[PDB]
Nucleic acid binder design. Structure first.
Ligand SMILES: [Mg+2]
Ligand SMILES: [Mg+2]
Ligand SMILES: [Mg+2]
Ligand SMILES: [Mg+2]
Ligand SMILES: [Mg+2]
Ligand SMILES: [Mg+2]
Ligand SMILES: [Mg+2]
Ligand SMILES: [Mg+2]
Ligand SMILES: [Mg+2]
Ligand SMILES: [Mg+2]
Ligand SMILES: [Mg+2]
Ligand SMILES: [Mg+2]
Ligand SMILES: [Mg+2]
Ligand SMILES: [Mg+2]
Ligand SMILES: [Mg+2]
Ligand SMILES: [Mg+2]
Ligand SMILES: [Mg+2]
Ligand SMILES: [Mg+2]
Ligand SMILES: [Mg+2]
Ligand SMILES: [Mg+2]
Ligand SMILES: [Mg+2]
Ligand SMILES: [Mg+2]
Ligand SMILES: [Mg+2]
Ligand SMILES: [Mg+2]
Ligand SMILES: [Mg+2]
Ligand SMILES: [Mg+2]
Ligand SMILES: [Mg+2]
Ligand SMILES: [Mg+2]
Ligand SMILES: [Mg+2]
Ligand SMILES: [Mg+2]
Ligand SMILES: [Mg+2]
Lengths: 64, 53, 111, 204
RNA sequence: GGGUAGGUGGUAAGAACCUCAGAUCCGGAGAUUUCCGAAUGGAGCAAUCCGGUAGUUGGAAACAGCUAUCAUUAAUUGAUGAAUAAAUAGUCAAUUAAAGCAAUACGUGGUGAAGUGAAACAUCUCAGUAGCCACAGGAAAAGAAAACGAAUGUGAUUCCGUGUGUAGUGGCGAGCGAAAGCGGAACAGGCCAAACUUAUCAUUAGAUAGGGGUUGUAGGGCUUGCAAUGUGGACUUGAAAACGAUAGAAGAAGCUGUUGGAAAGCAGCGCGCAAAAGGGUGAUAGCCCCGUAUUUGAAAUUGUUUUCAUACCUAGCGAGAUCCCUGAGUAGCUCGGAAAACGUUAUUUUGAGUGAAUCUGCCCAGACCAUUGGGUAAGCCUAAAUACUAAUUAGUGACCGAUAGCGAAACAGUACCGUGAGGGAAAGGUGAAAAGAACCCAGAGAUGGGAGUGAAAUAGAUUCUGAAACCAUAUGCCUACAACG
RNA sequence: UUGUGGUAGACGAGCGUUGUAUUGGAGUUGAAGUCAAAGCGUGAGCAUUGGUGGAUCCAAUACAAGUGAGAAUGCCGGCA
RNA sequence: AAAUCCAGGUACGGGUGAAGACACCCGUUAGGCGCAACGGGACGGAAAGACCCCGUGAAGCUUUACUGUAGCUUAAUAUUG
């Protein structure tokens, strides 16, 4: 599914309000961007993750 | 009409569908006026006077 | 225990037969009946049927048998008493044999 | 919804956020939680009332009461004649199981209450199953005969030990009293009267 | 264990047996439990087909009997091991859990319409309803203030009444509609992270396992003393006791006469009751029977509570130092949405982007600033009051009584309809007792007429009572030159 | 004394059914049901007798309704 | 068997009438009841008229009717040195 693998945060369903306040259901998708990390002997394994976790990954020194 | 709930009187008058015994806080208009006859205890009447106010 | 057993003397207290003495040959507890010999003699209109070795003859005319009687209409018969009378029974337990025995309430006769 | 493999993700970070929230290290605390809660008290500086509050717990616990029942009994006694600091003492000590324990046929107050609820207990103008009826100073409480038919007997002895405001004869299973417990028979475990003024604020 | 003298389930008679060394029957605990079905050795068109492995018995072997085992996923462990040296991927083996179903009912979460109303309709309402899906539990959810809110104020959550159809919110239209406060049901607050310290990891630890800590009238750590050995839990094992649940025992009191087919009705004279609830007995029985009130009883299993001991948690008030710690892609802010009564806005939440501070700190008191006051976010768990009844026991009804009551009083989700999902009926009563009509007559027989049983046969299996429409028979009157609601 | 035609409609007074609560009463020497007859009422309605039928029913005062069938190309059953 | 059927014992002429009568008014004719025929009528039967109109009815289709939207395209921003 279109979801992060580090966390479990997925899509957010909401309304597409326009002029005249017409209601149409729309979907916000999370920023799944490929990322490689070093875990368990630095083993790199491509993992589709949200940009938020990527920023979290960058500051936490893991990403090097 | 009984104020102290005597047990011997309640042991009797229970197989008789005709007669019955009640407390002052249990009798109502219908139970009083269905009686056609009633036996009232002296302290029940005094307790009635207190209740009547 | 049971009010009526197979064998004890019994009489009828209601119906056409009053003071009808007989011996109980068998008791149906489920239907609350009792077959007593000599009372309630009915004569079924016996047909003729021939489909078996015994049915080849099956000689049956006006056979009068026994009709079952409600156990309520029955009453135990006293024998030990000099003046026999109809009464009710108890279920006393004598410690001599620890076995339940029926005893009348208008006398002191066992069974 | 797949091979989540908690090892794969947990080790994947080793600190992050979710691991530490979840950190299997999570112990049991299955006794720390219960016991300390249990029941507390002490006195403080800013509210004063701390002493009053703690005394209520002790007082309520001495008889095994839920706070709601206490509010009912206080409401009843509050309105009557006047300075009733002699009335509510009789009311609090008028419990049947309290009298049964103070009567001396049970090792502990709660055991007496259990007995009462289990139908050991015979009264005068009535009988008794509920261990909460408010009794009148001069009432008798004849004990059943089935209880003596179950000789554990150890009890009768406690009965004679007694305290002066209760008059009960051993073995014969009978009890009554007069001259309701004075404050001496209500020892210094809980002897104060400003919790009383507190209940007027909380209970009208 | 209880309990007896009958039993071999119903349409059901007969034949043949069992049963007083205690049967049948009831209760507790066990044994066996074919195949399909989560189905799980493989398949497959469900109740079928085809096997592997390790044993053991016959055969000379193929083979055939008799056993146990053989699915997948996840976690742990061990062995083996690629591209490619190492190492992983992968492979294998062992152990532990998961699969599914149902209670046409309650809970949480995700998703989520339309008929309709606004007398049209698009905002709105319907409605976060129906439906779809996931996860449970015996309840679930919620929960211990970065709170309400305007005061010398309350002090977790939940539920009920009021506040009120109020303040408000609405193409200000249809409509929607709280939060405080007050009265009640119940009541309970706990625990980690960080400081500081111990031991160990090529100690590059930034990791593992312990002691210390859980906060707001700030708390804790650092150093130094006094007082403490207690009280209490949402708590483990045991022992004992009490109250029950799953079979049961005992349990009072009436005869006579009359109508009647039959008395229990009716009448006379009585009797018992902690029993006059009810059912049956040929009519309408307190005293005929079974029962009921009441007193009692459990070998075995199980529920609640209590006592004792026992693990495991739990403890106050000072002094100095002025040092350290108090939850960050977090709170805020911007761009689109939503939750709250609010149609998006102070408060809550988030899809994209950005992004702080550290008790002289941070958040809040309906834009916002200052003063005042309140509270300590970014960690976790939490009984009770609350929601529901497929089922078990007892019982009730100014509820129904075969077109009613569940669709289904009978063998009803049956017969039947449709490829299928699905749709879906009608039908009860002989008599106290079959004593169900032997026999005779007519007829081929069914059947009918007698006889017989029965109080009744015009109660006869077509079986309680038997209405009308409808079809026939007949006493009496009228009617074949007669225009007729 | 003045009146009494009447649809839509407004108002008032009553009848009838079932059950419940209080009183009393009838019933295998025959209750309900059901059929017939040459009865009583201003109206809903109410009796008497006889046949069939075989066990419940009636009167008064109140109370509560699934309470009153001629029509809906109304439903079911029966019969023309 | 079938559709039909308010109850019928169901004539014609002129007139009348909700405006075209077996049933009303005035006249005329006609013994009771069948059978075989053919269709004049009973505004005959079957189908709550498809034509027309009405309903602030439905559905299908069309477009430069309105409001939106899938898709396509352009820019900013993140992945992005
Ligand atoms: Mg809408
Ligand atoms: Mg046995
Ligand atoms: Mg709409
Ligand atoms: Mg509308
Ligand atoms: Mg919970
Ligand atoms: Mg018995
Ligand atoms: Mg008896
Ligand atoms: Mg009786
Ligand atoms: Mg803010
Ligand atoms: Mg909303
Ligand atoms: Mg502060
Ligand atoms: Mg904080
Ligand atoms: Mg039915
Ligand atoms: Mg019927
Ligand atoms: Mg005959
Ligand atoms: Mg009949
Ligand atoms: Mg003539
Ligand atoms: Mg002529
Ligand atoms: Mg004419
Ligand atoms: Mg004429
Ligand atoms: Mg008039
Ligand atoms: Mg009536
Ligand atoms: Mg009659
Ligand atoms: Mg009706
Ligand atoms: Mg026909
Ligand atoms: Mg004209
Ligand atoms: Mg004409
Ligand atoms: Mg036509
Ligand atoms: Mg039309
Ligand atoms: Mg329109
Ligand atoms: Mg682009």
């Amino acid at each position: 599914a279109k979801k992060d693998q580090l966390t479990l945060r997925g899509p957010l369903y909401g309304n597409n309000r326009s002029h005249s306040k017409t209601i149409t259901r729309r979907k916000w998708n999370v920023n799944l961007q490929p990322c490689k990390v070093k875990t368990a002997d630095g083993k790199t394994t491509r993992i589709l993750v949200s940009t938020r976790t990527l920023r979290t990954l960058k500051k936490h020194n893991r990403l090097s | 009409v009984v104020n102290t709930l005597n047990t011997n009187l309640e042991q009797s008058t229970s197989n008789i569908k005709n007669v019955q015994v009640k407390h002052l806080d249990k009798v109502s208009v219908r139970d009083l006026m269905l009686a056609n006859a009633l036996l009232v205890e002296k302290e029940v009447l005094k307790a009635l006077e207190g209740k009547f106010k | 225990m049971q009010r009526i057993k197979k064998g004890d003397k019994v009489v009828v207290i209601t119906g056409k037969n009053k003071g009808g003495s007989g011996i109980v040959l068998k008791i149906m507890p489920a239907r609350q009946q009792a077959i007593v010999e000599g009372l309630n003699k009915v004569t079924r209109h016996k047909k003729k049927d021939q489909t078996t070795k015994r049915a080849a003859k099956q000689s049956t005319g006006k056979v009068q048998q026994e009709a079952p009687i409600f156990l309520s209409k029955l009453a135990l018969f006293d024998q030990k008493a000099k003046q026999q009378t109809i009464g009710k029974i108890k279920y006393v337990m004598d410690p001599k044999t620890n076995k339940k025995t029926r005893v009348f309430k208008k006398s002191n006769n066992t069974l | 919804k797949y091979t989540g493999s908690i090892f794969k993700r947990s080790r994947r970070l080793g600190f992050s956020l979710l691991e530490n929230n979840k950190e299997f290290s999570k112990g049991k605390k299955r006794k720390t939680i219960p016991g300390q809660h249990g029941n507390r008290f002490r006195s403080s500086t800013m509210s004063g009332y701390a002493q009053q509050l703690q005394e209520k717990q002790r007082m309520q616990y001495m008889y095994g009461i839920t706070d709601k029942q206490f509010r009912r009994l206080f409401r009843l006694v509050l309105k009557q004649r006047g300075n009733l600091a002699v009335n509510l003492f009789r009311v609090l000590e008028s419990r049947l199981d309290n009298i049964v324990y103070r009567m001396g046929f049970a090792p502990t107050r709660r055991s007496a209450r259990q007995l009462v609820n289990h139908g050991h207990v015979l009264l005068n103008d009535r009988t008794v199953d509920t261990p909460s009826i408010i009794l009148n100073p001069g009432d008798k409480v004849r004990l059943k005969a089935k209880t003596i038919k179950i000789p554990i007997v150890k009890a009768a002895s406690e009965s004679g030990v007694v305290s002066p405001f209760v008059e009960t004869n051993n073995k014969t299973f009978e009890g009554t009293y007069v001259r309701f417990p004075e404050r001496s028979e209500l020892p210094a475990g809980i002897n104060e009267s400003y919790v009383v003024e507190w209940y007027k604020r909380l209970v009208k």
